Amino acid sequence: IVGGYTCGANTVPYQVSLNSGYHFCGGSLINSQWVVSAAHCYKSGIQVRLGEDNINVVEGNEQFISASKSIVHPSYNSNTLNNDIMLIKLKSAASLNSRVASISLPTSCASAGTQCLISGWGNTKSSGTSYPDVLKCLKAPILSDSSCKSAYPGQITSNMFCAGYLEGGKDSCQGDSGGPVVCSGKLQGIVSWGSGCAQKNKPGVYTKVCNYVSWIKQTIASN
Ligand SMILES: [Ca+2]
Ligand SMILES: [Mg+2]
């Protein structure tokens, strides 16, 4: 997250860190047994880490649970990143408490102008590399689809939306991939892609979760 702030320990209780010997993507807990992340974060051998703040220090509120199965969306296209979403089932149910909570799926899509909270342990520099050890947060609004499509001609589908600041300065970045975009208490997006980070006229692109609620509900109930 570039131009964001330190969230504070366990203030984003549904945020998860996917680890394969190191943190490589974020995710969101949707219930005690399931996590949603981005399909481009797919890897075999994932351990889901819940209740994390500093990912390099065991502070006492973590729960590390291995994944039993991963399901990438049936229509995920790695070349265009269309349908960039995946579900991960935990081998054991997480213990929900104040520090570990699930986030609600949306009943409708959010409007342009709605402010959301984006979080993650990704890069914090636009030009350079600095990976933080504690969770960073960013409040950003959903942008109109017209400004989103003008920034990326021929690359935005109805399963994506842009959020951020066209002036640049504030954005999600690599390492934040797969993490949550929560607006009005519902999980509306997943950090998917963008052009560099925090660049002028290059906002971040997010998977539009409201288009996948039936697939999510149906898939978790059958697995
Ligand atoms: Ca920790
Ligand atoms: Mg994240």
Coordinates of all heavy atoms in Angstrom, one line a residue, residues 129-209:
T129 N 11.5 -0.1 -3.5 CA 11.0 -1.2 -2.8 C 11.1 -1.1 -1.3 O 12.2 -0.9 -0.8 CB 11.8 -2.5 -3.2 OG1 11.6 -2.5 -4.7 CG2 11.1 -3.7 -2.8
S130 N 10.0 -1.3 -0.6 CA 10.1 -1.2 0.9 C 8.8 -2.0 1.3 O 7.7 -1.6 1.0 CB 9.9 0.2 1.4 OG 10.3 0.0 2.8
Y131 N 9.1 -3.1 1.9 CA 8.0 -4.0 2.3 C 7.9 -3.9 3.8 O 8.8 -4.1 4.5 CB 8.2 -5.4 2.0 CG 8.0 -5.6 0.5 CD1 8.9 -5.4 -0.4 CD2 6.7 -6.0 0.1 CE1 8.6 -5.5 -1.8 CE2 6.4 -6.2 -1.2 CZ 7.4 -5.9 -2.2 OH 7.1 -6.1 -3.5
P132 N 6.7 -3.5 4.3 CA 6.4 -3.3 5.7 C 6.2 -4.6 6.4 O 5.9 -5.6 5.8 CB 5.2 -2.4 5.7 CG 4.4 -3.0 4.6 CD 5.4 -3.4 3.5
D133 N 6.3 -4.6 7.7 CA 6.0 -5.9 8.4 C 4.7 -5.8 9.1 O 4.1 -6.8 9.4 CB 7.1 -6.1 9.5 CG 8.5 -6.4 8.7 OD1 8.5 -7.1 7.7 OD2 9.4 -5.8 9.2
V134 N 4.1 -4.6 9.2 CA 2.8 -4.4 9.9 C 1.8 -4.0 8.7 O 2.2 -3.5 7.7 CB 2.8 -3.4 11.0 CG1 3.7 -3.9 12.1 CG2 3.4 -2.0 10.4
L135 N 0.6 -4.3 9.0 CA -0.5 -4.0 8.1 C -0.8 -2.5 7.9 O -0.8 -1.7 8.8 CB -1.8 -4.7 8.6 CG -3.0 -4.8 7.6 CD1 -2.7 -5.7 6.4 CD2 -4.2 -5.3 8.3
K136 N -0.9 -2.2 6.6 CA -1.1 -0.9 6.1 C -2.5 -0.8 5.5 O -3.0 -1.8 5.0 CB -0.1 -0.5 5.0 CG 1.3 -0.5 5.5 CD 1.5 0.7 6.6 CE 3.0 0.8 7.0 NZ 3.3 2.0 7.8
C137 N -3.1 0.3 5.7 CA -4.5 0.7 5.3 C -4.5 1.9 4.4 O -3.7 2.8 4.4 CB -5.3 0.9 6.5 SG -5.9 -0.5 7.4
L138 N -5.6 1.9 3.6 CA -5.8 3.0 2.6 C -7.3 3.2 2.4 O -8.0 2.2 2.2 CB -5.1 2.7 1.3 CG -5.4 3.7 0.1 CD1 -4.8 5.1 0.5 CD2 -4.8 3.2 -1.2
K139 N -7.8 4.4 2.5 CA -9.2 4.6 2.2 C -9.2 5.2 0.8 O -8.4 6.1 0.5 CB -9.8 5.7 3.2 CG -10.0 5.1 4.6 CD -10.5 6.2 5.5 CE -10.9 5.6 6.8 NZ -9.8 4.9 7.5
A140 N -10.0 4.7 0.0 CA -10.0 5.2 -1.4 C -11.5 4.9 -2.0 O -12.1 4.0 -1.6 CB -9.0 4.4 -2.3
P141 N -11.9 5.8 -2.8 CA -13.2 5.7 -3.5 C -13.2 4.9 -4.8 O -12.2 4.7 -5.4 CB -13.6 7.1 -3.7 CG -12.3 7.7 -4.2 CD -11.2 7.0 -3.3
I142 N -14.3 4.4 -5.1 CA -14.5 3.6 -6.3 C -14.6 4.7 -7.3 O -15.3 5.7 -7.1 CB -15.8 2.8 -6.2 CG1 -15.7 1.7 -5.1 CG2 -16.1 2.2 -7.6 CD1 -17.0 0.9 -5.0
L143 N -14.0 4.5 -8.4 CA -14.0 5.5 -9.5 C -15.0 5.1 -10.6 O -15.5 4.0 -10.7 CB -12.6 5.5 -10.2 CG -11.5 5.9 -9.2 CD1 -10.1 5.7 -9.8 CD2 -11.7 7.4 -8.8
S144 N -15.4 6.1 -11.4 CA -16.4 5.8 -12.4 C -15.8 4.8 -13.4 O -14.6 4.8 -13.7 CB -16.8 7.1 -13.2 OG -15.6 7.7 -13.8
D145 N -16.6 4.0 -14.0 CA -16.1 3.1 -15.0 C -15.5 3.8 -16.2 O -14.5 3.3 -16.7 CB -17.2 2.1 -15.5 CG -17.5 1.1 -14.3 OD1 -16.5 0.6 -13.8 OD2 -18.6 1.0 -14.0
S146 N -16.0 5.0 -16.5 CA -15.4 5.7 -17.7 C -14.0 6.1 -17.4 O -13.1 6.1 -18.3 CB -16.3 7.0 -17.9 OG -16.6 7.5 -16.6
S147 N -13.7 6.5 -16.2 CA -12.3 6.9 -15.9 C -11.4 5.7 -15.9 O -10.2 5.7 -16.2 CB -12.2 7.8 -14.6 OG -12.8 6.9 -13.6
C148 N -12.0 4.6 -15.4 CA -11.3 3.3 -15.3 C -10.9 2.8 -16.8 O -9.8 2.5 -17.1 CB -12.2 2.3 -14.6 SG -11.4 0.7 -14.2
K149 N -11.9 2.8 -17.6 CA -11.7 2.3 -19.1 C -10.8 3.3 -19.8 O -10.1 2.9 -20.7 CB -13.0 2.1 -19.7 CG -13.7 0.9 -19.1 CD -15.2 0.8 -19.6 CE -15.9 -0.4 -19.1 NZ -17.3 -0.3 -19.4
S150 N -10.9 4.6 -19.5 CA -10.0 5.5 -20.3 C -8.5 5.3 -20.0 O -7.6 5.4 -20.8 CB -10.4 6.9 -20.0 OG -11.7 7.0 -20.5
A151 N -8.3 4.9 -18.7 CA -6.9 4.6 -18.2 C -6.3 3.3 -18.8 O -5.2 3.2 -19.2 CB -6.9 4.5 -16.7
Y152 N -7.2 2.3 -19.0 CA -6.8 1.0 -19.5 C -7.7 0.6 -20.7 O -8.6 -0.3 -20.6 CB -6.9 0.0 -18.4 CG -6.1 0.3 -17.2 CD1 -6.7 0.7 -16.0 CD2 -4.7 0.1 -17.2 CE1 -5.9 1.0 -14.9 CE2 -4.0 0.4 -16.1 CZ -4.5 0.8 -14.9 OH -3.7 1.1 -13.8
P153 N -7.6 1.2 -21.9 CA -8.4 0.9 -23.1 C -8.4 -0.6 -23.5 O -7.4 -1.2 -23.6 CB -7.9 1.8 -24.2 CG -7.3 3.0 -23.5 CD -6.6 2.3 -22.2
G154 N -9.6 -1.1 -23.7 CA -9.7 -2.5 -24.1 C -9.3 -3.5 -23.0 O -9.2 -4.6 -23.3
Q155 N -9.1 -3.1 -21.8 CA -8.6 -4.1 -20.8 C -9.6 -4.3 -19.6 O -9.4 -5.2 -18.9 CB -7.3 -3.7 -20.1 CG -6.2 -3.5 -21.2 CD -4.9 -3.1 -20.5 OE1 -4.7 -2.0 -20.2 NE2 -4.1 -4.0 -20.0
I156 N -10.6 -3.4 -19.4 CA -11.5 -3.6 -18.3 C -12.8 -4.3 -18.7 O -13.4 -3.9 -19.7 CB -11.9 -2.2 -17.8 CG1 -10.5 -1.4 -17.4 CG2 -12.8 -2.2 -16.5 CD1 -9.6 -2.1 -16.4
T157 N -13.2 -5.3 -18.0 CA -14.4 -6.0 -18.3 C -15.4 -5.7 -17.1 O -15.1 -4.9 -16.2 CB -14.2 -7.6 -18.2 OG1 -13.8 -7.9 -16.8 CG2 -13.0 -8.0 -19.1
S158 N -16.6 -6.2 -17.3 CA -17.6 -5.9 -16.2 C -17.3 -6.6 -14.9 O -18.0 -6.3 -14.0 CB -18.9 -6.4 -16.8 OG -18.6 -7.6 -17.5
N159 N -16.3 -7.4 -14.9 CA -15.9 -8.1 -13.6 C -14.8 -7.3 -12.9 O -14.2 -7.9 -12.0 CB -15.4 -9.5 -13.9 CG -16.5 -10.3 -14.5 OD1 -17.6 -10.2 -14.1 ND2 -16.2 -11.0 -15.5
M160 N -14.5 -6.1 -13.3 CA -13.5 -5.3 -12.7 C -14.0 -3.9 -12.4 O -14.9 -3.4 -13.0 CB -12.3 -5.1 -13.6 CG -11.7 -6.4 -14.1 SD -10.5 -6.0 -15.5 CE -10.1 -7.7 -16.0
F161 N -13.3 -3.2 -11.5 CA -13.7 -1.8 -11.2 C -12.3 -1.2 -10.7 O -11.4 -1.9 -10.3 CB -14.8 -1.6 -10.1 CG -14.4 -2.0 -8.7 CD1 -13.8 -1.1 -7.8 CD2 -14.8 -3.2 -8.2 CE1 -13.5 -1.5 -6.5 CE2 -14.5 -3.6 -6.9 CZ -13.9 -2.7 -6.0
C162 N -12.2 0.1 -10.8 CA -11.0 0.8 -10.4 C -11.3 1.6 -9.2 O -12.5 2.0 -9.0 CB -10.6 1.9 -11.5 SG -9.8 1.3 -13.0
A163 N -10.3 1.8 -8.4 CA -10.5 2.5 -7.1 C -9.2 3.2 -6.9 O -8.1 2.7 -7.3 CB -10.7 1.6 -5.9
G164 N -9.2 4.4 -6.3 CA -8.0 5.1 -6.1 C -8.1 6.6 -6.3 O -9.2 7.2 -6.2
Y165 N -7.0 7.1 -6.7 CA -6.8 8.6 -7.0 C -6.1 8.7 -8.4 O -4.9 8.3 -8.5 CB -5.9 9.2 -5.9 CG -6.6 9.0 -4.5 CD1 -6.4 7.8 -3.8 CD2 -7.5 9.9 -4.0 CE1 -7.1 7.6 -2.6 CE2 -8.2 9.7 -2.8 CZ -8.0 8.6 -2.1 OH -8.6 8.4 -0.9
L166 N -6.7 9.4 -9.3 CA -6.1 9.6 -10.6 C -4.9 10.5 -10.5 O -4.0 10.4 -11.3 CB -7.1 10.2 -11.6 CG -8.2 9.2 -11.9 CD1 -9.2 9.9 -12.8 CD2 -7.7 7.9 -12.5
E167 N -4.9 11.3 -9.5 CA -3.7 12.1 -9.3 C -2.5 11.3 -8.9 O -1.3 11.7 -9.1 CB -3.9 13.2 -8.2 CG -4.7 12.7 -7.0 CD -6.3 12.8 -7.2 OE1 -6.8 13.9 -7.4 OE2 -6.9 11.7 -7.3
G168 N -2.7 10.1 -8.4 CA -1.6 9.2 -8.1 C -1.3 9.4 -6.6 O -2.1 10.0 -5.9
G169 N -0.2 8.9 -6.1 CA 0.1 9.0 -4.7 C -0.3 8.0 -3.7 O 0.4 7.6 -2.8
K170 N -1.5 7.6 -3.9 CA -2.2 6.5 -3.0 C -2.7 5.3 -3.9 O -3.4 5.6 -4.8 CB -3.3 7.2 -2.3 CG -2.8 8.1 -1.2 CD -3.9 9.2 -0.8 CE -3.6 10.5 -1.6 NZ -3.6 10.3 -3.1
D171 N -2.3 4.1 -3.5 CA -2.7 2.9 -4.3 C -2.3 1.6 -3.5 O -1.6 1.7 -2.6 CB -2.0 3.0 -5.7 CG -2.5 2.0 -6.8 OD1 -3.5 1.3 -6.6 OD2 -1.8 2.0 -7.8
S172 N -2.8 0.5 -4.0 CA -2.5 -0.8 -3.5 C -1.2 -1.1 -4.4 O -0.9 -0.4 -5.4 CB -3.6 -1.9 -3.7 OG -4.0 -1.8 -5.1
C173 N -0.5 -2.2 -4.1 CA 0.7 -2.5 -4.9 C 1.0 -4.0 -4.7 O 0.3 -4.7 -4.0 CB 1.9 -1.6 -4.3 SG 3.3 -1.4 -5.4
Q174 N 2.1 -4.5 -5.4 CA 2.4 -5.9 -5.3 C 2.6 -6.2 -3.8 O 3.2 -5.5 -3.0 CB 3.7 -6.3 -6.1 CG 4.6 -5.2 -6.6 CD 4.5 -5.0 -8.1 OE1 3.8 -4.1 -8.5 NE2 5.1 -5.8 -8.9
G175 N 2.1 -7.4 -3.5 CA 2.2 -7.9 -2.0 C 0.8 -7.7 -1.4 O 0.5 -8.4 -0.4
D176 N 0.1 -6.8 -2.0 CA -1.3 -6.5 -1.5 C -2.3 -7.4 -2.3 O -3.4 -7.6 -1.8 CB -1.7 -5.1 -1.7 CG -0.9 -4.0 -0.9 OD1 -0.6 -4.4 0.3 OD2 -0.6 -3.0 -1.4
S177 N -1.8 -7.9 -3.4 CA -2.7 -8.8 -4.3 C -3.5 -9.8 -3.5 O -2.9 -10.4 -2.6 CB -1.7 -9.6 -5.2 OG -0.9 -8.7 -5.9
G178 N -4.7 -10.0 -3.9 CA -5.6 -11.0 -3.2 C -6.3 -10.4 -2.0 O -7.3 -11.0 -1.5
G179 N -5.9 -9.3 -1.5 CA -6.5 -8.7 -0.3 C -7.8 -8.0 -0.6 O -8.2 -7.8 -1.7
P180 N -8.5 -7.6 0.5 CA -9.8 -7.0 0.6 C -10.0 -5.5 0.3 O -9.0 -4.7 0.5 CB -10.3 -7.2 2.0 CG -9.0 -7.1 2.8 CD -7.9 -7.7 1.9
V181 N -11.1 -5.2 -0.3 CA -11.5 -3.8 -0.6 C -12.9 -3.9 0.1 O -13.8 -4.6 -0.4 CB -11.7 -3.5 -2.1 CG1 -12.2 -2.1 -2.3 CG2 -10.3 -3.7 -2.7
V182 N -13.1 -3.2 1.2 CA -14.4 -3.3 1.9 C -15.0 -1.9 1.9 O -14.4 -0.9 2.2 CB -14.1 -3.8 3.4 CG1 -15.4 -3.7 4.3 CG2 -13.6 -5.2 3.4
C183 N -16.3 -1.9 1.5 CA -17.0 -0.7 1.4 C -18.3 -0.9 2.1 O -19.0 -1.9 1.8 CB -17.3 -0.4 -0.1 SG -15.9 -0.8 -1.2
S184 N -18.7 0.0 2.9 CA -20.0 -0.1 3.7 C -20.2 -1.5 4.4 O -21.3 -2.0 4.3 CB -21.1 0.2 2.8 OG -20.8 1.5 2.3
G185 N -19.1 -2.0 4.9 CA -19.2 -3.3 5.6 C -19.2 -4.5 4.8 O -19.4 -5.6 5.4
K186 N -19.1 -4.4 3.5 CA -19.1 -5.6 2.6 C -17.9 -5.7 1.8 O -17.3 -4.7 1.4 CB -20.3 -5.6 1.6 CG -21.6 -5.2 2.2 CD -22.1 -6.3 3.1 CE -23.5 -5.9 3.6 NZ -24.2 -7.0 4.3
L187 N -17.5 -6.9 1.5 CA -16.3 -7.2 0.7 C -16.8 -6.9 -0.8 O -17.5 -7.7 -1.4 CB -15.9 -8.7 0.9 CG -14.7 -9.0 0.0 CD1 -13.4 -8.3 0.4 CD2 -14.5 -10.5 0.0
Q188 N -16.3 -5.8 -1.3 CA -16.7 -5.5 -2.7 C -15.6 -5.8 -3.7 O -15.8 -5.9 -4.9 CB -17.1 -4.0 -2.8 CG -18.4 -3.7 -2.0 CD -19.7 -4.1 -2.6 OE1 -20.8 -3.8 -2.2 NE2 -19.7 -4.8 -3.7
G189 N -14.3 -5.8 -3.3 CA -13.2 -6.1 -4.3 C -12.1 -6.9 -3.7 O -12.0 -7.1 -2.5
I190 N -11.3 -7.3 -4.7 CA -10.1 -8.1 -4.4 C -8.9 -7.3 -5.1 O -9.1 -7.0 -6.3 CB -10.2 -9.5 -4.9 CG1 -11.4 -10.2 -4.1 CG2 -8.9 -10.4 -4.6 CD1 -11.7 -11.5 -4.8
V191 N -7.8 -7.1 -4.5 CA -6.7 -6.4 -5.1 C -6.3 -7.3 -6.3 O -5.8 -8.5 -6.0 CB -5.5 -6.2 -4.1 CG1 -4.4 -5.5 -4.8 CG2 -6.0 -5.4 -2.9
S192 N -6.4 -6.8 -7.5 CA -6.0 -7.6 -8.7 C -4.8 -7.1 -9.5 O -3.8 -7.8 -9.5 CB -7.3 -7.7 -9.6 OG -7.1 -8.5 -10.7
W193 N -4.9 -6.0 -10.1 CA -3.8 -5.5 -10.9 C -3.7 -4.0 -11.0 O -4.5 -3.3 -10.4 CB -3.8 -6.1 -12.3 CG -5.1 -5.9 -13.2 CD1 -6.2 -6.6 -13.1 CD2 -5.2 -5.0 -14.2 NE1 -7.0 -6.1 -14.1 CE2 -6.4 -5.2 -14.8 CE3 -4.3 -4.1 -14.8 CZ2 -6.8 -4.4 -15.9 CZ3 -4.7 -3.3 -15.9 CH2 -5.9 -3.5 -16.4
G194 N -2.9 -3.5 -11.8 CA -2.7 -2.0 -12.1 C -1.5 -1.8 -12.9 O -1.0 -2.8 -13.4
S195 N -1.1 -0.6 -13.1 CA 0.1 -0.2 -13.9 C 1.1 0.4 -12.9 O 0.8 1.6 -12.5 CB -0.3 0.7 -15.0 OG 0.8 0.9 -15.9
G196 N 2.1 -0.3 -12.4 CA 3.0 0.3 -11.4 C 2.2 0.5 -10.2 O 1.1 -0.2 -10.0
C197 N 2.6 1.4 -9.4 CA 1.8 1.7 -8.2 C 1.8 3.2 -7.9 O 2.9 3.8 -8.0 CB 2.4 1.0 -6.9 SG 2.6 -0.8 -7.1
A198 N 0.7 3.7 -7.6 CA 0.4 5.1 -7.3 C 0.9 6.1 -8.4 O 1.2 7.2 -8.1 CB 1.2 5.4 -5.9
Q199 N 0.8 5.6 -9.6 CA 1.2 6.5 -10.7 C -0.1 7.4 -11.2 O -1.2 7.0 -11.0 CB 1.6 5.7 -12.0 CG 2.9 4.9 -11.7 CD 4.1 5.8 -11.5 OE1 4.6 6.5 -12.4 NE2 4.7 5.9 -10.3
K200 N 0.2 8.5 -11.7 CA -0.8 9.4 -12.1 C -1.6 8.7 -13.3 O -1.0 8.0 -14.1 CB -0.1 10.7 -12.6 CG -1.1 11.8 -13.1 CD -0.2 12.9 -13.5 CE -1.0 14.0 -14.1 NZ -0.2 15.1 -14.6
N201 N -2.8 8.9 -13.3 CA -3.8 8.3 -14.2 C -3.8 6.8 -14.4 O -4.3 6.2 -15.4 CB -3.6 8.9 -15.7 CG -3.8 10.4 -15.5 OD1 -4.8 10.8 -14.9 ND2 -3.1 11.2 -16.2
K202 N -3.2 6.1 -13.4 CA -3.1 4.6 -13.5 C -3.7 4.1 -12.1 O -2.9 3.6 -11.3 CB -1.6 4.2 -13.7 CG -1.1 4.5 -15.1 CD -1.9 3.6 -16.2 CE -1.4 3.8 -17.6 NZ -2.2 2.8 -18.5
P203 N -5.0 4.1 -11.9 CA -5.6 3.6 -10.7 C -5.5 2.1 -10.5 O -5.2 1.4 -11.4 CB -7.0 4.1 -10.7 CG -7.3 4.2 -12.2 CD -6.0 4.7 -12.9
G204 N -5.8 1.6 -9.4 CA -5.7 0.1 -9.2 C -7.0 -0.5 -9.7 O -8.0 0.2 -9.8
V205 N -6.9 -1.7 -10.1 CA -8.0 -2.5 -10.7 C -8.2 -3.6 -9.7 O -7.3 -4.3 -9.2 CB -7.6 -3.0 -12.1 CG1 -8.9 -3.6 -12.8 CG2 -7.0 -1.8 -13.0
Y206 N -9.5 -3.8 -9.4 CA -10.0 -4.8 -8.5 C -11.1 -5.7 -9.0 O -11.9 -5.3 -9.9 CB -10.7 -4.0 -7.3 CG -9.6 -3.0 -6.7 CD1 -9.4 -1.8 -7.2 CD2 -8.8 -3.5 -5.7 CE1 -8.4 -1.0 -6.7 CE2 -7.8 -2.7 -5.1 CZ -7.6 -1.4 -5.6 OH -6.5 -0.7 -5.1
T207 N -11.1 -6.9 -8.5 CA -12.1 -7.9 -9.0 C -13.4 -7.4 -8.3 O -13.5 -7.1 -7.1 CB -11.8 -9.3 -8.4 OG1 -10.5 -9.6 -8.9 CG2 -12.7 -10.4 -9.0
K208 N -14.5 -7.4 -9.1 CA -15.8 -6.9 -8.7 C -16.6 -8.1 -8.0 O -17.3 -8.8 -8.7 CB -16.5 -6.4 -9.9 CG -17.7 -5.6 -9.6 CD -18.1 -4.9 -10.9 CE -19.3 -4.1 -10.7 NZ -19.5 -3.6 -12.1
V209 N -16.4 -8.3 -6.8 CA -17.0 -9.4 -6.0 C -18.5 -9.6 -6.1 O -19.0 -10.7 -6.0 CB -16.5 -9.3 -4.5 CG1 -17.0 -10.4 -3.6 CG2 -15.0 -9.4 -4.3

